[PDB]
Amino acid sequence: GQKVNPVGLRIGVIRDWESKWYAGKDYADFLHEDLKIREYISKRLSDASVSKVEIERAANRVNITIHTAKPGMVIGKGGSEVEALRKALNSLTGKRVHINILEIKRADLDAQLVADNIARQLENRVSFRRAQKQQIQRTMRAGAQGVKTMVSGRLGGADIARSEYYSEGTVPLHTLRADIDYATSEADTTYGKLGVKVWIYRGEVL
Amino acid sequence: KGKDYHVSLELDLRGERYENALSRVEKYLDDAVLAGYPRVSIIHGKGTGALRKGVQDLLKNHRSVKSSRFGEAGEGGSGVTVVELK
Amino acid sequence: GPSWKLSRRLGISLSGTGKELEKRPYAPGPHGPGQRKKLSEYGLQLQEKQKLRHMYGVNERQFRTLFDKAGKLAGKHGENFMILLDSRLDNVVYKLGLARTRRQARQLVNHGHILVDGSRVDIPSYLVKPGQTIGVREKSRNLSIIKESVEVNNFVPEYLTFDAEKLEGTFTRLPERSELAPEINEALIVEFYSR
Amino acid sequence: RIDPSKLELEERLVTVNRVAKVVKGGRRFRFAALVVVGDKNGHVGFGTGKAQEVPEAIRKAVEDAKKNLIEVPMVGTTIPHEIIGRFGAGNILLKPASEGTGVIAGGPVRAVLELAGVADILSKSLGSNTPINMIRATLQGLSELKRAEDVAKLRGKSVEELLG
RNA sequence: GGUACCUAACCAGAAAGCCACGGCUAACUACGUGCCAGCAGCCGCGGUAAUACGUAGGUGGCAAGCGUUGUCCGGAAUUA
RNA sequence: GGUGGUGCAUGGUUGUCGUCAGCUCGUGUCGUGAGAUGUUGGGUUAAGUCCCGCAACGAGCGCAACCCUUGAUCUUAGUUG
RNA sequence: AGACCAAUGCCAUGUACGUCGCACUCGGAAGAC
Structure with missing residues (x-):
């Protein structure tokens, strides 16, 4: 079938687990706890865009950092909503939590945000050509070494699904020394389901 | 929290692209909230004028801004257009 | 409502007024507001033909026939056509300002008259002969809409002439420029009907 | 005798033409399109291009059109x-x-x-x-x-x- | 033939339809149907998500006419 | 709420040729156009691997390497060895 | 230059097309020493 995921291949050799803590004999419920907390932030902060979240379990008290740049408004006058969401987190996790927010510079070349973007104007009904083409030029203007974008599904032609891509530069997936960042997002429209995948090559790792 | 930043009270947006700018005016509004500014301004161009009318509609449907207004005679007239937030 | 629907079907108001485009500029029909394909090399000039058709309201066999009379006329093949519609008498009562819509014009020329070189005119063919003094009375001189026509100033151009008290005027020596072309994309007519 | 692209030139697409290649994996699909360019007064050319997609196809055609002109x-x-x-x-x-x-x-x-x-x-x-x-x-x-x-x-x- | 004409008064009331909407070729959607019922000038559409069938709306074209058929000439430089 | 159908509406998945060395593009030439040239020729390699030629010049996905393990040794640390 | 191989059931296979960049204002009294 397909390839393996580049970042799944690169986990542990170039990439972090973003769950850096260790559990033993509480691994299970700890693990499903990281799943539902990720679900909570994912469908709460979907407006302000989140890419990835790192969970720390220092002295079993959970500790969170959240990435990306648009939550600069979450950091700002919305210290109240930061406190409220954190109160809901301690409502969900028993033992309390502490959260931090990390700004991301060049949020254009982060795969999660790219995929969420393409899913958004695919819901907003721009042509997939226009969406992919402006996004790819925006990333390689930002300084990415090479970007390939995917789309699949009923691309207007509901009677037969197909797939479309554009890519330039270099995207060496076969080289494990490369830094790759992968996203998938699922654009839902009246036609059914439209699939978005995107991955970014950003130079090698010495 | 992030604390390495300072945010300016104005911005000049002359002589560049539409869909390049609106990515970084949304970022600039988010920066102004982090510094808690009640008022900001984005100086624009004259000739093509597409972004000059183009940005103001985005702030009208933006989730954080209530209004965008032109300048007064005591400030210099149309030399500034002002924006205020929620 | 003819005028409104055809204004948005057409993209331009046929009356020349700004309304009927001010909040429905796209099209009629449920598939109006979508972005449309550019019109074809038959669509564009049929569309232009419908401009020139319904901003008078005249029909197609009359179109083809006055087209042939324009062709038989010794001037250039297209501007003779538009000046013949200029000389069509409901256009004459429009640009003399008595009529405010051409649906007012046709109804009123059914009602009233012009006695310039006539006795009673119901049909828009003729032209003012230069140098005669016959004038309109009673049936288009003293009634209620008669002064409602010239209660306001509407522009009467150079190839026409007008006075307002008895509300009558004549075709002058020659029509030249705006009468040649107000805004009309000409020669699409001649290529359409010459297909 | 070659006329440079110092003038302004209008373009008009006349035909996008579907073209195909048969390969071991199957049929391969490509787009040719030709355009005509010129000015309203005395200079005219045309251009052809081949690409997998319409806009850069007609772009290749329009650079070839900017290359070749002829006076009438x-x-x-x-x-x-x-x-x-x-x-x-x-x-x-x-x-x-x-x-x-x-x-x-x-x-x-x-x-x-x-x-x-x-x-x-x-x-x-x-x-x-x-x-x-x-x-x-x-x-x-x-x-x-x-x-x-x-x-x-x-x-x-x-x-x-x-x-x- | 008391015809047309000429006058007065009553009533916005007595009076618009046909065909097309895949392309050629102007006009798109909903439902039903499901190689059945069917459409068709040509290319062709329909084997359960049919802008091509049949309905409804909407649009388009023309109008006291509108479509179909038959015949003749063009298009046909296709007897040149 | 449907493990009530429709992979011939689909996303996300997976096998297969095949770990085969192929697959393509930008720009430029030639043809009119379909297209070609690059990618063919000489030699070489597990390999479109490389070299020399050559109206092509380059580029990308490929290939190789970069990762893990297994093979030989140095230093660090000697416990629950 | 060298043996012998017969057949493969009606339809129907796809898409393609659609960007748009440029701004800041004008000017009273002032001696002699």
């Missing part, structure tokens, strides 16, 4: 004389029509002629009806037309005895 002589907003087009079963008749007649041509020949900005001309398709062979035959036609003054120069005469 113009004696009183119409062509001077008789000329038949001739290239590879492409036969296009051009007759110096009188004034006020407008353009009378088929699809692609009108598409090149109005982009040449010639007022009054009439024509006929006598060769095959493929558009590229049309345009090639027509520009081979207007390449052949000459002014009266240079013919008088070749004669060692003036223009009066040749107009009369």
Whole structure:
């Protein structure tokens, strides 16, 4: 079938687990706890865009950092909503939590945000050509070494699904020394389901 | 929290692209909230004028801004257009 | 409502007024507001033909026939056509300002008259002969809409002439420029009907 | 003799043409398109391009169009004389029509002629009806037309005895 | 033939339809149907998500006419 | 709420040729166009691997390497060895 | 230059097309020493 995921291949050799803590004999419920907390932030902060979240379990008290740049408004006058969401987190996790927010510079070349973007104007009904083409030029203007974008599904032609891509530069997936960042997002429209995948090559790792 | 930043009270947006700018005016509004500014301004161009009318509609449907207004005679007239937030 | 629907079907108001485009500029029909394909090399000039058709309201066999009379006329093949519609008498009562819509014009020329070189005119063919003094009375001189026509100033151009008290005027020596072309994309007519 | 791209030039797409390649994996799909360019007064070219997608396809065509142009002589907003087009079963008749007649041509020949900005001309398709062979035959036609003054120069005469 | 004409008064009331909407070729959607019922000038559409069938709306074109058929000439440089 | 159908509406998945060395593009030439040239020729390699030629010049996905393990040794640390 | 191989059931297979960049204002009294 397909390839393996580049970042799944690169986990542990170039990439972090973003769950850096260790559990033993509480691994299970700890693990499903990281799943539902990720679900909570994912469908709460979907407006302000989140890419990835790192969970720390220092002295079993959970500790969170959240990435990306648009939550600069979450950091700002919305210290109240930061406190409220954190109160809901301690409502969900028993033992309390502490959260931090990390700004991301060049949020254009982060795969999660790219995929969420393409899913958004695919819901907003721009042509997939226009969406992919402006996004790819925006990333390689930002300084990415090479970007390939995917789309699949009923691309207007509901009677037969197909797939479309554009890519330039270099995207060496076969080289494990490369830094790759992968996203998938699922654009839902009246036609059914439209699939978005995107991955970014950003130079090698010495 | 992030604390390495300072945010300016104005911005000049002359002589560049539409869909390049609106990515970084949304970022600039988010920066102004982090510094808690009640008022900001984005100086624009004259000739093509597409972004000059183009940005103001985005702030009208933006989730954080209530209004965008032109300048007064005591400030210099149309030399500034002002924006205020929620 | 003819005028409104055809204004948005057409993209331009046929009356020349700004309304009927001010909040429905796209099209009629449920598939109006979508972005449309550019019109074809038959669509564009049929569309232009419908401009020139319904901003008078005249029909197609009359179109083809006055087209042939324009062709038989010794001037250039297209501007003779538009000046013949200029000389069509409901256009004459429009640009003399008595009529405010051409649906007012046709109804009123059914009602009233012009006695310039006539006795009673119901049909828009003729032209003012230069140098005669016959004038309109009673049936288009003293009634209620008669002064409602010239209660306001509407522009009467150079190839026409007008006075307002008895509300009558004549075709002058020659029509030249705006009468040649107000805004009309000409020669699409001649290529359409010459297909 | 080559005219540079210092002028402003209008473009007009006449045909996007589906093209295909058969390979071991199956059929492979490509897009050719040809366009005609020029000015309304005296200079005209055309261009062809091949690409997998419409916009950069017509872009390749339009750079080839910016590369190649040809001048057309113009004696009183119409062509001077008789000329038949001739290239590879492409036969296009051009007759110096009188004034006020407008353009009378088929699809692609009108598409090149109005982009040449010639007022009054009439024509006929006598060769095959493929558009590229049309345009090639027509520009081979207007390449052949000459002014009266240079013919008088070749004669060692003036223009009066040749107009009369 | 008391015809047309000429006058007065009553009533916005007595009076618009046909065909097309895949392309050629102007006009798109919903439902039903499901190689069945069917459409068709040509290319062709329909084998359960049919802008091509049949309905409804909407649009388009023309109008006291509108479509179909038959015949003649063009398009047809296709007897040149 | 449907493990009530429709992979011939689909996303996300997976096998297969095949770990085969192929697959393509930008720009430029030639043809008119379909297309070609690059990618063919000489030699070489597990390999479109490389070299020399050559109206092509380059580029990308490929290939190789970069990762893990297994093979030989140095230093660090000697416990629950 | 060298043996012998017969057949493969009606339809129907795809898409393609669609960007748009440029701004800041004008000017009273002032001695002699």
